[PDB]
Amino acid sequence: LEAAHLLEQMEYVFDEWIHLCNNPHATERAAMIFVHQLHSVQLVTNRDEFLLFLRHALDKSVERFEQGIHSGASIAESFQAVEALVKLIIIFVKSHSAAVAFMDSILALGVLVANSHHVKRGENFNQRVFYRFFALLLHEVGLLAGHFSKSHYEQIILNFAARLFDMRPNLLPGFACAWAGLVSHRAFLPVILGLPDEKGWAPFTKLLEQFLGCVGELVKTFTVSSLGKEMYHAALKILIVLQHDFPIYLDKFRVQLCQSLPLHATQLVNLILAAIPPNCNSLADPFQAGLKVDKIPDMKERPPTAFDSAGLLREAGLLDILERMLQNGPSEDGVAQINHAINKSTSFGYVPLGVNRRLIDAVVARFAEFAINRASSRSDSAIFVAGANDIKTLQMLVTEVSPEARYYLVSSMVNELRYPNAYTNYFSQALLDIFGHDMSDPEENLVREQIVRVLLERVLGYWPQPWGLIITILELLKNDKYLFFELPFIKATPEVAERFTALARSAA
DSSP states (O other): OTHHHHHHHHHHHHHHHHHHHHOTTOOTHHHHHHHHHHHHTTSSOSHHHHHHHHHHHHHHHHHHHHHHHHHTOOHHHHTHHHHHHHHHHHHHHTOOOHHHHHHHHHHHHHHHHHHHHHHHOSTTOOHHHHHHHHHHHHHHHHHTTTTSOHHHHHHHHHHHHHHHHTTOTTTOGGGHHHHHHHHSOTTTHHHHHHSGGGTTHHHHHHHHHHHHHHHHHHHHTTOOSHHHHHHHHHHHHHHHHHHHHOHHHHHHTHHHHHHHSOTTOHHHHHHHHSOOOTTOOOOOOTTSTTOOTTSOGGGGOOOOOOOOHHHHHHHHTOHHHHHHHHHHOOOHHHHHHHHHHHHOOOOTTOOOOOOOHHHHHHHHHHHHHHHHHHHHHSSSOOSOOTTSHHHHHHHHHHHHSOHHHHHHHHHHHHHHOOSSSHHHHHHHHHHHHHHHTTSSSHHHHHHHHHHHHHHHHHHHSSSOOOHHHHHHHHHHHHOTTTOGGGSTTTTTOHHHHHHHHHHHHHOO
């Protein structure tokens, strides 16, 4: 009843504020008179009444924008309503942590209004006005970087990353394009990763995994719509930027990002893997002369990882048995217990169809870590040992594991061989050892078909490949005993053989 009058008062105040911003014959002093007057005439006494005013103002800004666009006015002319709101907002944040709590409340406010216009108008949602709102706030805060303390500024950035996640394409699918532009925005993306001690890497990787996953699902459904193209192109551009500007982050969180993407999305995944650290200059041409990988310094260095492989296994309660198998050699009961946990994603008439990706990625990662400890202890300082228990543990693992499940098992190892490092080194030696194990046996031959089928898919595409990818395959080609040419898989596909032969003829 009386509540209707209150809203009409809030709307009237905001209208007067817009007119002041639009009037060129207005003095600069006029604006600060308006804001001081807001508290004296009891228009806005409490902090809640201010938020309510800002709730209604952001709502009107959206209505004003749609009004302007439909009228035929320029897009800049229609933005003046939401722009006037942001200006008033900035006035209060410079009046001063209260400022951090004030910024956070407005961010959460924008989320509420965005969700409101998506609930009330799902198909009639307009991303343009809401994107402009958050984009301006990102820009203005960046200008006030010197004002806030070093700790207060970081809190605002982290809170911004928190509020962006509250507007997921899963929860706000009609805001996906704009949300993508906010994650890739030059006022947020560089500053979140720019924070010291990698404080912003964890919030950012959460947004990105939602983003990459959103694209991946679109891609799988054979999209032709502008949405899919806009979303996929945004994915390409953001990964290209991340690779060049922040290669260390893309190297450290490589596992988490690949999981968000479907495996067959080869190009998107390749952008993550082909990334190289700035310090590394050991990148040599695989084709050149008689290149010997064993004589490389960075081949023993351990790349950084944000992946918690050890913790994920412990949480699954399978960490203890794996380490016991890495010490005591492969055990039949052990592999079977790991395999069941892998295929689990039990009751009467129940069969598993899905495979746990992350658990597999955890297991694979542990085989390399145990090789690192060995190298430090040994006088030979070699990472890979052909007669060790772990390589036989991995050997038996690939054999007894489900065909679909072994596909993810091998794909994990190939994903690890990238630029010259210990992980690339270990899995390059390990993947060949499995391929060379019991070549005469028919069952092992089938596994060899699964390995080449994965490798062939990665090199089939016309794009820069990882270093370790080419290195491993060339060794698989150059070696006589491997007889890759006369593998029943290579005998099966003529077109794949054509592509492979071209690589074999470039294999100087």
